[PDB]
Design a protein around this ligand. Structure first.
Ligand SMILES: Nc1nc2c(ncn2[C@@H]2O[C@H](COP(=O)(O)OP(=O)(O)OP(=O)(O)O)[C@@H](O)[C@H]2O)c(=O)[nH]1
Ligand SMILES: Nc1nc2c(ncn2[C@@H]2O[C@H](COP(=O)(O)OP(=O)(O)OP(=O)(O)O)[C@@H](O)[C@H]2O)c(=O)[nH]1
Ligand SMILES: COc1ccc(/N=N\c2cc(OC)c(OC)c(OC)c2)cc1O
Ligand SMILES: [Ca+2]
Ligand SMILES: [Mg+2]
Ligand SMILES: [Mg+2]
Lengths: 436, 155, 426
């Protein structure tokens, strides 16, 4: 057993973190006060769930998690909510004044006032670990804190924890539920400064999640509560291999080995199926072939892009529930007889499969129906370059006129940092073109 | 030199002092360094009684300063309606043009003195007179969206 | 980001300032003595943004009242909410400024400025996390214009990292035919381009035109004009005073609305327009973007929107608002710059203003605002070319070059708006 520490930064990171930890508790049988009756070893243990939860002498199972925000309103909802007794009170860190949607305030001026306290509190959790493997960092690209403070934090974690893995869950901006006009700037600046310091990053496109809520869940106008519940189900499916027994993606290093062929092209695409409305409680149960085929439909993707226009470098299928391995083999064999799936000529043309035989858990109050079998596909495809091109184009439209740049330069940032970040994104776009 | 004292009395509105200075031979048409006369100053600072008395004592109603301003241009710019009427009754040239190509109509229109615009139009102000940039008083009203002024200039 | 310190200077500044406090006190359930008589918790959630909590559960405005004329203090005190203000927060001089900007900025105004700054310091030290300042004033007089801009620069020196916002009333000969007002306004605009982060332009020309042509009031009074100003000020401060989906503050407004530092002059708008004593979502979105509903006498269809913030108040479908706002942007696509993506932001607040079930407030950063600056510039130049009444200013120590510098800076501002009006994406 090797421990994982989760860090939730800014509003989006904190709200998604709250939804994830609620779901983890329901999956593991942990009550809101931290008690876990099924855990026979009181005060300690080496079980797979201990990768995410420590244990106290009184039988309390505490998340190995830190929540940080530069203003207190969002974290105050965690401090007074249903799971207020679950977290380490010193694990919930707040400043008084936020980054005002400005990367430079998050990174250089406001962020510097709390960075040392956050690192000292992370060290307290790290000191409790026997074999820390690394960190899971949750944050928006668009927010000033999610963009700027996260980049500063990832820079410091690389110096203080050199050999440890760092994985991100990043929220990619959408016009439908955006906060700021400058989100494309914050997104490019954080991507450039974090690229070296992150080993693998799962982007979540808010437009993709918004469309899934509208089309599959019949939610006319999805709110963050609806988006976050669906995101938490996908994040749970991705982290399940670290918290339960299994043979695929059992540690953070294996995520890199399986999904990241080269350091810079470290952005896998997630696809999840089936997503069925809770109002359809008597829905027909979909077979392994049906849910597997649905992974290759662009409508079920976590990022809007078309994998038919790209090439695959890796593909992992993670099943949960009543899934017979021979049915997976037969469904994959059918999938290989389809012109739309092309692998690069230098990777083995194969699929890695993991099965957890417990079906997914649904949260009370959620929008999803219970299902007997579900799948999350993680792939590294060159089609994800389409998401970077869309973001780079919005950056270029404003940057050509230097619109809003004075706000960043006024908060300790050099104008040349914008050109350096954009040049790195042009190189990243060419890295995908050179693979295919 | 009583001309310099008459210029100060006309600006300050000292009615009795104007009468004493003229009775002692002060030059009613004295000029300051920029070519302004006692009548220009009384019309700028709104001293109606001084304007009337200077006109009964040989003041040139159409005197121009170094920039071509007549007393009517200054009364129309500052918005002294009663002074505009007295100057017009005493022969002021309604279409006098200064070094910027402005007429009294242009200045009354720019400053929004609509009652003075009406009086000038009734006394034959030329709606086609162009300033040095080609603008008439109607062009000024259209360019600044002053519908009240555009309505008066179309009557 | 919570507390705002409000300052009101001069006659106009104190008149519109007092009406602002009357209108927002009624929305938050605060009575003239400072007691809360409301029936909703959403009224008290962000009350500390504008009010201090005194002993006895009394809410006192965080407001400083300034004037060189003592008489203004009497009119404020005699008003309905005149006793709610802190008596120590009234800072008044002996003799006014006589509509002379130089007296407000360099002589009478400079003598009283340290007293005002003492009161500003005491209100600021009493804040948990001060966001910045809000000033109400006219630009055509002497105190609000001359002393108001001096106060802005001094507050800017002591609090350089806080936001400075103004509600600045622009002069018009339709409301006050006083020919030195274009001088006072141009001298003030030179100061506001450098020393404020965001300025709401409230134009007396537009207020008169709405009252006369749209509301059919044959002889508009200051009370009629101030009814539109108070409705606008309530609307634009909605997201600072109520929770909503956004945690809005003055800095997030500036970062998202001001792409170039000097272009921080907003054109506010309001729908429905109503007179004292006397709609569907598609009607409100349409009226909100109409020239007849703007509080600056500019036609938005003569320029382009750089950024827009809209606030809808009342009970309505947020899906309907999203669709109608998307529709107005598609049909009016040539009036938005194409190089600032997603430059229109909408907020919906459940609490409507008094006497209305539904309302909409618009805040536009439009290049068409150059029409307002051009109108003032032409009047300033007509007067300045003849050096009319210049001795009234130079006699107070002002240099003639300050007039030339103010004129040149305002003509440069107009050129900067034209530059972005003509720019293309390519
Ligand atoms: N999916 C999802 N997106 C969110 C959530 N909250 C905010 N966002 C997105 O995150 C971006 C805004 O960043 P935030 O995380 O709110 O900002 P922040 O990190 O708190 O930074 P500052 O407030 O600027 O200091 C926008 O693209 C929002 O749509 C959430 O709970 N879920
Ligand atoms: N909308 C509106 N404009 C007003 C009001 N009071 C004055 N004004 C305008 O403000 C300008 C005159 O400035 P005032 O505020 O009266 O002057 P002040 O700031 O007190 O300065 P001094 O009197 O010169 O010391 C003119 O353009 C007036 O039309 C008011 O209540 N509402
Ligand atoms: C143009 O886009 C934006 C504009 C402002 C933004 N931030 N904060 C505010 C938003 C407001 O209304 C929507 C507002 O109401 C007036 C407000 O008052 C304080 C602040 C965010 C944006 O993406
Ligand atoms: Ca145990
Ligand atoms: Mg935030
Ligand atoms: Mg006054």
């Amino acid at each position: 057993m090797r421990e994982c520490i989760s860090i939730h930064v800014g509003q989006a990171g904190v709200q998604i973190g709250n939804a994830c930890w609620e779901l983890y508790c329901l999956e593991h049988g942990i009550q809101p006060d931290g008690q876990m009756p099924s855990d026979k070893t009181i005060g300690g243990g080496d079980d797979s769930f201990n990768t995410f939860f420590s244990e106290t002498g009184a039988g309390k199972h505490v998340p190995r998690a830190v929540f940080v925000d530069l203003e207190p309103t969002v974290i105050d909802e965690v401090r007074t909510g249903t799971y207020r007794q679950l977290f380490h009170p010193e694990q919930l860190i707040t400043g008084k004044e936020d980054a005002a949607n400005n990367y430079a305030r998050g990174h250089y001026t406001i962020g510097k006032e709390i960075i040392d306290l956050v690192l000292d509190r992370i060290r307290k959790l790290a000191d409790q670990c026997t074999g820390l493997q690394g960190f899971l960092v949750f944050h928006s690209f668009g927010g000033g804190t999610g963009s700027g403070f996260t980049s500063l934090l990832m820079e410091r974690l690389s110096v203080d924890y050199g050999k440890k893995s760092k994985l991100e869950f990043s929220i990619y901006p959408a016009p439908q539920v955006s906060t700021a006009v400058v989100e494309p700037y914050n997104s490019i600046l954080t991507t450039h400064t974090t690229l070296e310091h992150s080993d693998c990053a799962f982007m979540v496109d808010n437009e993709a999640i918004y469309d899934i809520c509208r089309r599959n869940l019949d939610i006319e106008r999805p709110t963050y509560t609806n988006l976050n519940r669906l995101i938490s189900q996908i994040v749970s499916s991705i982290t399940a291999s670290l918290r339960f027994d299994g043979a695929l993606n059992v540690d953070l290093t294996e995520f890199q080995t399986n999904l990241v062929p080269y350091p810079r092209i470290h952005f896998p695409l997630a696809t999840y199926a089936p997503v069925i409305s809770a109002e359809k409680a008597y829905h027909e149960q979909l077979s392994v072939a049906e849910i597997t085929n649905a992974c290759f439909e662009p409508a079920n993707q976590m990022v809007k892009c078309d994998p038919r226009h790209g090439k695959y470098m890796a593909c992992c299928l993670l099943y949960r529930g009543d899934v017979v391995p021979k049915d997976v083999n037969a469904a994959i064999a059918t999938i290989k007889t389809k012109r739309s799936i092309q692998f690069v000529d230098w990777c083995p043309t194969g699929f890695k499969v993991g099965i957890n035989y417990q079906p997914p858990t649904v949260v009370p109050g959620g929008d999803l129906a219970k299902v007997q079998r579900a799948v999350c596909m993680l792939s590294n495809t060159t089609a994800i370059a389409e998401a970077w091109a869309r973001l780079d184009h919005k950056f270029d439209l404003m940057y050509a006129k230097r619109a809003f740049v004075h706000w960043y330069v006024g908060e300790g940032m050099e104008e040349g940092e914008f050109s350096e970040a954009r040049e790195d994104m042009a190189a990243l776009e060419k890295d995908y073109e050179e693979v295919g | 030199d009583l001309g310099k004292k008459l210029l100060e009395a006309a600006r300050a509105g000292q009615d009795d002092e104007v009468r004493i200075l003229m009775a002692n031979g002060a030059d009613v048409n004295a000029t300051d360094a920029s070519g302004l006369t006692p009548l220009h100053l009384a019309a700028t600072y709104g001293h109606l009684e001084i304007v009337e008395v200077l006109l009964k004592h040989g003041a040139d109603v159409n005197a121009i300063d170094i920039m071509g301003s007549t007393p009517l241009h200054l009364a129309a710019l500052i918005g002294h309606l009663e002074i505009v009427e007295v100057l017009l009754k005493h022969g002021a040239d309604v279409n006098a043009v200064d070094t910027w190509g402005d007429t009294p109509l242009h200045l009354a229109a720019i400053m929004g003195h609509l009652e003075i615009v009406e009086v000038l139009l009734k006394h034959g102000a030329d709606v086609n007179a162009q300033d040095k940039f080609g603008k008439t008083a109607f062009d000024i009203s259209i360019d600044n969206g002053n519908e009240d002024l555009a309505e008066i200039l179309q009557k | 980001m919570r507390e705002i310190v409000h300052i009101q200077a001069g006659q106009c500044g104190n008149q519109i300032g007092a009406k602002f406090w009357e209108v927002i006190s009624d929305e938050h359930g605060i009575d003239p003595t400072g007691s809360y008589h409301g029936d909703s918790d959403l009224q008290l959630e962000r009350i500390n943004v504008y009010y201090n909590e005194a002993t006895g559960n009394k809410y006192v405005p965080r407001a400083i009242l300034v004037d060189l004329e003592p008489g203004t203090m009497d009119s404020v005190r005699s008003g309905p909410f005149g006793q709610i203000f802190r008596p120590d927060n009234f800072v008044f001089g002996q003799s006014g400024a006589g509509n002379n900007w130089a007296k407000g900025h360099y002589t009478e105004g400079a003598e009283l400025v340290d007293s005002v700054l003492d009161v500003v310091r005491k209100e600021s030290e009493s804040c948990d996390c001060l966001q910045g300042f809000q000033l109400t004033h006219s630009l055509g007089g002497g105190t609000g214009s001359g002393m108001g801009t001096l106060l802005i620069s001094k507050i800017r020196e002591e609090y350089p990292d806080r936001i400075m916002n103004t509600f600045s009333v622009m002069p018009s000969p339709k409301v006050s035919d006083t020919v030195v007002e274009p001088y006072n306004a141009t001298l003030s605009v030179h100061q506001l381009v450098e020393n404020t982060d965001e300025t709401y332009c409230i134009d007396n020309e537009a207020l008169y035109d709405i009252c006369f042509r749209t509301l059919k009031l044959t002889t508009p009074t200051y009370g009629d004009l101030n009814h539109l100003v108070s409705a606008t000020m309530s609307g634009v401060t909605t997201c600072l005073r109520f929770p909503g989906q956004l945690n809005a503050d003055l800095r997030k407004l500036a970062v998202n609305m001001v792409p170039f530092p000097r272009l921080h002059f907003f054109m506010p708008g309001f729908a429905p327009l109503t007179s004292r004593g006397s709609l569907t979502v598609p009607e409100l979105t349409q009226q909100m973007f109409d020239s007849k509903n703007m509080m600056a006498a500019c036609d938005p269809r003569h320029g382009r929107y750089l950024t827009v913030a809209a606030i809808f108040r009342g009970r309505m479908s947020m899906k309907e608002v999203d669709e109608q706002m998307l529709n107005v942007q598609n049909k009016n696509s040539s009036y938005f710059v194409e190089w600032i993506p997603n430059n229109v932001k909408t907020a919906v607040c459940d609490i409507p203003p008094r006497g209305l079930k539904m309302s909409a407030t618009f805040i536009g950063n439009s290049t068409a605002i150059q029409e307002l600056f051009k109108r003032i510039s032409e009047q300033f130049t007509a007067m300045f070319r003849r050096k009319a009444f210049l001795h009234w200013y130079t006699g107070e120590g002002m240099d003639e070059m300050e007039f030339t510098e103010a004129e040149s800076n305002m003509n440069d501002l107009v050129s900067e708006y034209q530059q972005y009006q003509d720019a293309t994406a390519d």
